[PDB]
Each structure stands twice: as C-alpha cells, then as structure tokens.
Amino acid sequence: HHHTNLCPFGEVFNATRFASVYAWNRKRISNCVADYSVLYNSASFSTFKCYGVSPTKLNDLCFTNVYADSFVIRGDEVRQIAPGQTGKIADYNYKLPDDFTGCVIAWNSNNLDSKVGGNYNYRYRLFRKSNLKPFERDISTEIYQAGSKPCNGVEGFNCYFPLQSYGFQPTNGVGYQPYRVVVLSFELLHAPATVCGK
Amino acid sequence: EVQLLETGGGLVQPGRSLRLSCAASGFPFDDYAIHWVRLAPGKGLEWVSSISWDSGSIGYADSVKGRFTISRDNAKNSLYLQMNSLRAEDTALYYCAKGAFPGYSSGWYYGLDVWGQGATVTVSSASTKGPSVFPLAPSGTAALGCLVKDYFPEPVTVSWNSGALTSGVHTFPAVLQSSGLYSLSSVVTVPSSSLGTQTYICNVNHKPSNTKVDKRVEPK
Amino acid sequence: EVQLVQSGAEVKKPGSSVKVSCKASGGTFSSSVISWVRQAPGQGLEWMGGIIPLFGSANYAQKFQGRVTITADESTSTAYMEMTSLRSEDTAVYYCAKVSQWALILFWGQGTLVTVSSASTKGPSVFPLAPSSKGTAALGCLVKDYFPEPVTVSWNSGALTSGVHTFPAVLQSSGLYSLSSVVTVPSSSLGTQTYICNVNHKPSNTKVDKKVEPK
Amino acid sequence: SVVTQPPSASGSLGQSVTISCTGTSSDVGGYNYVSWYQQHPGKAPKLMIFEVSKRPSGVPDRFSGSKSGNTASLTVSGLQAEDEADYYCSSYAGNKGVFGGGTKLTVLGQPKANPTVTLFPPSSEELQANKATLVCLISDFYPGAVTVAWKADSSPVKAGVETTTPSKQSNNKYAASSYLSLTPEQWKSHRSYSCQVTHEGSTVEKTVAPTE
Amino acid sequence: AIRMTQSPGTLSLSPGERATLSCRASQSVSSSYLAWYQQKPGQAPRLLIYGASSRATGIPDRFSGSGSGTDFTLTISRLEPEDFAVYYCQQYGTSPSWTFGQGTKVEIKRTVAAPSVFIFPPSDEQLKSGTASVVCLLNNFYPREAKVQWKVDNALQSGNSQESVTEQDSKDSTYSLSSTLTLSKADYEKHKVYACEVTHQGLSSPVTKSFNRGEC
Lengths: 198, 220, 215, 212, 216
Ligand SMILES: *[C@@H]1O[C@H](CO[C@@H]2O[C@@H](C)[C@@H](O)[C@@H](O)[C@@H]2O)[C@@H](O[C@@H]2O[C@H](CO)[C@@H](O[C@@H]3O[C@H](CO[C@H]4O[C@H](CO)[C@@H](O)[C@H](O)[C@@H]4O)[C@@H](O)[C@H](O[C@H]4O[C@H](CO)[C@@H](O)[C@H](O)[C@@H]4O[C@H]4O[C@H](CO)[C@@H](O)[C@H](O)[C@@H]4O)[C@@H]3O)[C@H](O)[C@H]2NC(C)=O)[C@H](O)[C@H]1NC(C)=O
Ligand SMILES: [Cl-]
What we know:
Chain A: This is Spike protein S1. The PDB classes it as viral protein. The structure holds five protein chains of five kinds. By secondary structure, chain B is mainly beta. In chain B, 2% of the residues lie in helices and 49% in strands. In chain B, the strands form four sheets. In chain B, strands 2, 4, 5, 6, 9, 10 and 11 form a seven-stranded mixed sheet that branches. In chain B, strands 12, 13, 15, 16 and 17 form a five-stranded antiparallel sheet that branches. In chain B, a hairpin with a 5-residue loop joins strand 4 and strand 5. Chain B starts with a strand and ends with a strand. Chain C is an all-beta fold. Chain C has two domains: 114 residues, Immunoglobulins (Immunoglobulin-like, Sandwich), CATH 2.60.40; 88 residues, Immunoglobulin-like (Sandwich), CATH 2.60.40. In chain C, strands 2, 4, 5, 6, 9, 10 and 11 form a seven-stranded mixed sheet that branches. In chain C, strands 12, 13, 15, 16 and 17 form a five-stranded antiparallel sheet that branches. Chain E has two domains: 105 residues, Immunoglobulins (Immunoglobulin-like, Sandwich), CATH 2.60.40.10; 97 residues, Sandwich (Immunoglobulin-like), CATH 2.60.40.10. Chain E contains two helices and 18 strands. In chain E, the strands form four sheets. In chain E, strands 2, 4, 5, 6, 8, 9 and 10 form a seven-stranded mixed sheet that branches. In chain E, strands 11-12-16-15 form a four-stranded antiparallel sheet. A four-stranded antiparallel sheet of chain E has the order 14-13-17-18, with no helix packed on it. In chain E, strand 4 and strand 5 form a beta hairpin. Chains B and D meet through strand 5, helix 1, strand 10, strand 12 and strand 13 of B and strand 3, strand 7, strand 8, helix 1 and strand 11 of D. The site of chloride ion has 2 residues of chain C, from strand 5.
C-alpha cells in the first residue's frame, strides 16, 4: 500500500513470444504489490518448484527485489532449471546458483511455439569453453575454430556455429516439445521491503 | 588431423606407481577437456578421470579415487595420469579421448569422437623378460617371417623394412604359454621372384625390456 | 473460470442517476485494473475510467470526470459505475473491462443498456407508406411511437422476404422509438397482390397487421 | 558395471538386431545424453550415436538409437559382415559418465571360409641354441572355431603344444597360431611333423621334415 | 493524454483480399498493452488480439497483429465474408488509463449503384392525430455516402429529419437509407410542395422526388 502500483507480471508469463534460452530475458520487478494467489492457485503449470520459499506463503512475505527470467527449452531439459543440476542447458545456457531462493515455473507450450505457421526460431548454445556462472548470459555467435584452419567467419569441417535450433515444427514426444519457463528470484537484502503480497 | 597419442605404459608391481602421458595435436588443446578411459581384459570400457581446460574441474571414478591424479600442461599440449597404489584390477589398456566441442561435460553430451590408440599397463609381480627373435625362412608367392619367442609382458611391435613393407604383412596374436611367457610370429607374403632381389628385415620392439632387434630373413 | 457479469438493462428518466454493477468471479478481482467502457448507438468505444480495487484510487477520463464515480468492493468482488444527471446523450451500452496484473488478455462483461427517456412502455402506431401511382414500386410501414426496443416486422406473415428493408429504429426527441420497414415490388402487381406488414411488440403485447394499399 | 548390457547378441545378414542398455534414473534414465560406441578388434572405439538417436557425420542410417526409461537401445538394420564388433553404451551421470558392460554382436548367415595354413620348421639359429619350435599359422577363416592337432610321423604329439584363441583380423576373419616345442634331438628323430587344422568338418594338413 | 488514431476510416475490399489496418499512437506505447477488437452490428466487441500479437481463443490465424512504438498493424491475410466489420485498437496497461481508436470499417467493394428514390406522404390516419411524417427512401445504392435535403415549398429544412441506414446487404452489397421529416399538422397544412433531394456519386445530378399535399 506504500507502493501504489501493480507488479506487471503479465508481460512475463503472458507474452506472445518468449526468448531463446541462450538469450534469456530478465525483467526487474520493484516497488509494487502482487496477489500471488493468482499464481499458486493456477492449474496451468506442469512445474512449480520453489526453493527457500513456500509457494502458498508468497503473500505473507515482502522482498527487496524480484527478478523474472523467462525462456523456452525442451521438456526433458526443464529438470535442469534447478539448483545443483547440470546438463547442456544448465552448463551453457541458463544456470541457477546452489543457494537459489525462488520458484521455477514451467508449462507445456506446444500450442504456442509449435503452431502450423512457424517462424518462432528457438535456439540454444551447444558448447561453451567454461560453464556459465549463476545468472550469466552468453549471446555470442562467434564461429569456433576447433581445428587447424582458420574459419574466416563461415561454418565448416571443424568450424562450429555455437547455436542450434530446437526443431519444434514437427510433431514429437512430450519430452521433445517446447516448454515455457519463468524463474522468479526473490531477494531479501538489507534494502526496504518493496515487492509485497496482498 | 585431430590426434591423441598415449605414452608411458608398461610393467609395474602391485603397490608401485606409473605415469601415463597423452599428446594432443590438430586442435586447440588450451580450451578442451580430456578424459581417460580404460579397457580391462574380460571387461568393458570404464571411465577413469576427466579434467577441464583450466584444471578447475576434476572428476574420478570411485574405483580409482584417492589413488590416481590427473593433470595437464597446456603449454606442452599434454595430459597426464599419475597412477599410484596399482592393483591387479588396474591392468588395462588406457585411452585418451575427447569430444568434438569444448566443454567439461560436452564429451558426455555429444559423445567422445576422437580417441587415442591406447597404452597397455600391466600390473604384475613377474619380472620383465626380453624375447629371442628367430627368422622364418621361406621354402608364384612365398611366405616368410620371424618368430618372437618367450617374452613378457605384452606387447611387442613388429614392422618390416622399418615400416616400408606393409603390403602382405600379417602379425599374429601371441600365445600365453604355460610357462607364462608370450610368443608371437609375424609373417609377410611376397612374390617368389623377388627372394634373391629384395631384402626382408623384421623390426621387433619390446619396450618393457628395451629390446630392439633387426633380424634379416633370407632363404635357406 | 474468470467471468464478468453485469446487471440488467435500465431505463432512467433525464436528471436521475444509475449505478451499474459488475460481479467478477475467479479470484483475479483485487489484483486487476477494472475499467468502464461506453458505446453510444452508432458510435465507437469510449473509455470512461478505471480503478484498482487494492488501492481504491479511481482514475477518470476528462469527459466523464464530473458525473461518473467508479467504486470497487473487494469483499464481494463487484465493481460499480454510477453516473448522475443523466441526459439522452448518455443512452449507451456500458461495459466493464478488466486486466489482471498476471496476464495481458482483457476480460469483458456482457454490456448493460442504459436508455435515458421519460416514456413508459407503449405499443406502436402503424401507418402505411402507400405506393405511388406515378417498373418497380415501393411500399412500407411506419412503426411509430413505441417503447422500448425491439419491434419485429414481417410482410404477409413471412411469405414476402425479398426486397424488404427494415431500418434500425431511432430514438426520437420524445423518447419513443420509430422505424420504417419498406419493400420494393413490381408495379404491375400493385393491384393484384395484397401486402400486409405484421408488427409485433412483445414488451407491450401488441400485434398489429396493417394493409398497405395504393392511394 | 552400473549400466548392464547383454554380453552377446546376434542377427542374420541383411536383417536387424537390437542391443539394449539398462541403467538407472541417475544416468541413462536421468538425461537424454546416451551415446553408442563401436569397437572393432584392435581399434579405438568409434562414436556411432549421441543424444540417444543422432548420428555423427559418416555413420550410416542403418544405426538408430532410442530410449524408454532406464533402457536405451541401438538398432542395426541391413546387417553386414563388418558390423561384427563390440558395442558399448555411454551416458552422462552428473559431472561424470558411465559405460555399459558391452555386447559382442555376431552376424549369422555368412559364407564359411576355410583357413590358410603355413607350417614353419625350426630355424637354424634356434637349433644352434639347443631349442626347436614348430610354428603353425592359421588365417583367413570363418567362423572362429578350429581344432589343431600335431603329429610326429603318423602318431599324435602329447605336450609342448601352445595354441592361441582365435581372434578377428582386419578383414573380419579369424586368425590363430599353434607352437610345438621340441628338443633338437626330438626334431631330427622323426621323419616328419604335421599340423592338422580341422575347421567346420574339413581338415588342412601341412608337413615339415628335418632333412627336406 | 495518449491518442490512438486509426487509418483508414473505411476499407473497401473484396473477399479473398488482404486487409491492412493501421493504429497510430501519439506517444510510444508498450506493445505488451495494445489490443484489437472486432465488432459486428448488434454485437458486443470481440477481442481479437492482445499483447500486440496474441490471438484470443477461437480467433483464426489469418488475423495477425504486429508493430511497436507508435505504429501497430492488424493484417487479415485473406478476407472471409464474416470478417467485414468494424475494428478498434486499444491502448491499456496496469494503470487505470486506457484509450481506444475511433475504428475502421472493412466493407465489401462493389460497383457504384445509384439509389432509387421514393417519397411517401403522411397517412391520413396519422394526420388525425396531429403529426405528419414524410418518409424519403434511398434504395440499394453504393457507396454509403449520400445526402438527403428536405425541401418544403423550396425552403431547405434542417433539424427536423432523422436518418437510418441498413447494414450492407449480404446479397448485393448495397445500402439503403430512410430519412423521416416530422412536422406538426398545423405546419404540414401551411405548405404545399414537399421534396427530398438526393445527392450521390452514382447520380450525374441530384435527384429530387416530390409531391403536392392534397394531390392524388
Ligand atoms: C495469457 O493468459 C490468458 C488468461 O489465462 C487465464 O487468466 C489468468 C489471469 C490466469 O488466471 C490463468 O491461469 C487463466 O487461465 C490465457 O487465456 C486462457 O488460456 C487458458 C488455457 O489455454 C484457457 O483455459 C482453458 O479454457 C477451456 C475452455 O474454457 C471454459 O469456459 C468456456 C466459457 O468461458 C466454456 O465455453 C468452455 O466449455 C470451458 O468450459 C477449459 O476447458 C480448460 O480448462 C481445462 O482444465 C482446467 C484445469 O486447468 C479444468 O478446470 C477444466 O475442467 C478443463 O478440463 C480439464 O479437465 C477435463 C476433465 O473434466 C479434461 O477433459 C481436460 O483435458 C482438462 O484436463 C482451460 O482452463 C482460458 O479459457 C483462456 N482465457 C481466455 C480469457 O481466453 C492465454 O492463453 C495466455 N496467453 C499466452 C500467450 O500465454
Ligand atoms: Cl477512449
């Protein structure tokens, strides 16, 4: 009631299109109130795993800041969006810290990102020299020279473009369908309490 | 081409130590991760150890944890495996393998696509024994060879004419004799008319005993 | 699950006020921006104002600042639009439209017709639009002075449907409605074919069949 | 071995065969990072499949991989002779990996090939060293089963016989060898020695003599 | 205040064609809070697009929204008959402050058709009640623009007439219009010549239909 604005969570969960995981979007949520019961009473989520906070208790807590990261990954890759997990996505695309406090929310989006029309080109990073630090973003598209000959900016024998499309256009299994993911990070620091429940 | 070569195998008594080396070329060693995989007789491939590009991440199998140490020198494009407190179960052929992409676990994600030839490591209290090389004289083609009798341990490497003769060459697997010594024979098939013209010399190399013999095989 | 239900249509006489309600179900009420949109007949959509029930601080368009008050009741999940000093220019359909902070979709009510008029329920007088003597001729019925909407016009008990144009009614200055329904027929059949328009006005229980004959 | 694997498998030339690979929910069942490797005798493992079903450049479409739970599978269709090899599965396991026990594939329906046999007498250098070794080399045969018998003149020879287990060579055929140890006195005592190689009901016999 | 202006006012196309509707904003508007509505006569507005480009439930894929900043666009790749209607855009947000565009009408293109004009004197039974209604009919014309001038003894009227137009006819894509002049009986008997003059693009010259009060 001190901050008289509604947290704009709509443009995160409800956007027409999400970002590719390698270029994951982050929106900073600050000085606003939110009725989180609309979130934890929704049945539209196939994944709602929280760490350090109780989901049904979000309205009882206030936070200094809230971060909302969103992206699209394969179904079988959603389990990598969790503290302590490893894999192609956790190592090279999006990585949560070991002391993560927040919630990982995911839902099947075959109806949105695999429509008969197309044009949504979701991609991921196949390889990186070192693993991503927690909450690090890498949007480099530099062709990697893995052999002896210089690449001169073109793909080749050992000249690998670092990104690859998911191939969501055809019909594939549930584990191979696109899933939209939102990661809410709740930060309780020494600053005044801004993002509260109601 | 991308290449990995292992060196440093041989004989070692139980409880003693041995050091393996892996040389890398044809790719930027400085930003890849490398792994060791062993093939024990009568068993399947077994992962041994991994090390990231900057040595920041190191993993070991539970069978070798506390006894093996992995390390690398990026300036020499070389990877090492220090094997201490060797047991009989540690007798295996030790491979050096990597993935196509940089990344610590990317060799598991996309597969290990470049392997070395391997380095045999034999853990036994039996002592080294060098072989005796005898020529096998030939008696429109003819077969000649040379016999590598009574040696330990595996392996020996036989080449003909310092490697210039590779066509028609067949080096056979060795017998494990009841005496405990290995014996092996290598044979080449050559046209009959070139017996009085071409010189045939088998090059036996048994690195455990530092044996290097060049035996000329001529008709009787 | 989310659904906005508005109260029923109303007839208010000039000078009075009206308070339209809008009951929300589904739990998104408190964390929503609930607006009131207005559409006068023959015109477009006009945003009047809105409120966030969590804060209770309503905001209003300049055109409606004076006579429109928007309230919200969290205990019952109902929003209200009260408009005082009603005039005939305020005859419109009033919608509540709502946006939840958790989505970008808009939720709409079904609309509430507010008619500003001093008339009571009244059946229509039906006058002929006789075809002129001086290849096709036009005849029709003038359905005048009824309240409220609607009236139904058929010709020859539904046997004549081709060429019939029933025009939308107009709210006259008197507060009563009026509409014409015409049809074009061959001038050769004016003396042979009988033309009767059937007007039905269910609010007043009025059925009138008028025979339209040449002058 | 954490990931079990049937020790052997078989299939007919031109038909199909499936090789399963059963792990746990923390490796094979925990990720879609299952790889398959082919190892011919005497060569390093070759990568055939990665990420359950993807093929590296150069691997024919006869090899396909799938997964269902903790069990991965590799299917080889249009079975050919060179397909005879060892097959291991691999899987990420969280900052580590693991290999299956391995499977030895046998391609049935192949044409039988009889062996080539070369028998060598003792060299003059070995005889001068008070030793004698007969060498009997067997190559280019299929299948691997083979029986070796030594004869002094026409009577069988008891001891001093060492024989390999038959193993595959570069052209997917088997090779074996047998060694007869003798004293120089025994070698010159008999008129001849024979190496009898019996394979699939047919016998090959080579003979050497001291005087000849 | 933010102003959303739509262009064009009217869009005259044929079934099977591509419709491109514009929505201009006076300031930069977040593309997360821009919507499109379809409205058919007698119906509440139908939400088409929200969040610049998301299709509401049941909306076919031939409707697509796009744009950013101050220029937004609704594209109908292939017009079906059911698509001919009025389209509004709307700026909104998480604050109580929304605006709408004035709308764009997508109608059926057709060859020009002149109106057939008919004038109708007030009925005698109506004159018994003290009021006279004179009805002028413009039948089956295209396009919709038409002027109706009432003349009473060649004196041009204003303020005593009301117009109604039918929706575009589903068969021949024409409109029809009725203008009703209202006079008291006392006024109606003061004058003789009653005429409505009709101006329309399909007429070389304005057409006037008239009658003299009292003639048969
Ligand atoms: C952006 O957000 C939009 C808004 O989302 C809604 O609002 C926000 C604030 C939040 O509360 C959300 O949780 C909420 O959904 C999204 O639009 C919404 O998208 C929903 C999912 O696609 C959609 O829900 C579906 O609606 C159908 C049909 O609607 C009913 O009502 C209409 C009248 O309005 C009737 O005519 C119909 O007959 C329906 O009865 C509904 O069937 C679906 O519900 C299924 O699952 C529910 C549990 O999740 C069950 O309660 C329900 O029974 C039903 O069936 C299940 O169980 C059956 C067995 O009985 C089984 O057979 C079946 O398979 C199911 O498993 C579902 O709820 C909303 O209607 C829609 N809202 C609007 C206004 O359009 C939008 O998609 C988002 N956009 C992006 C880009 O993300
Ligand atoms: Cl407005």
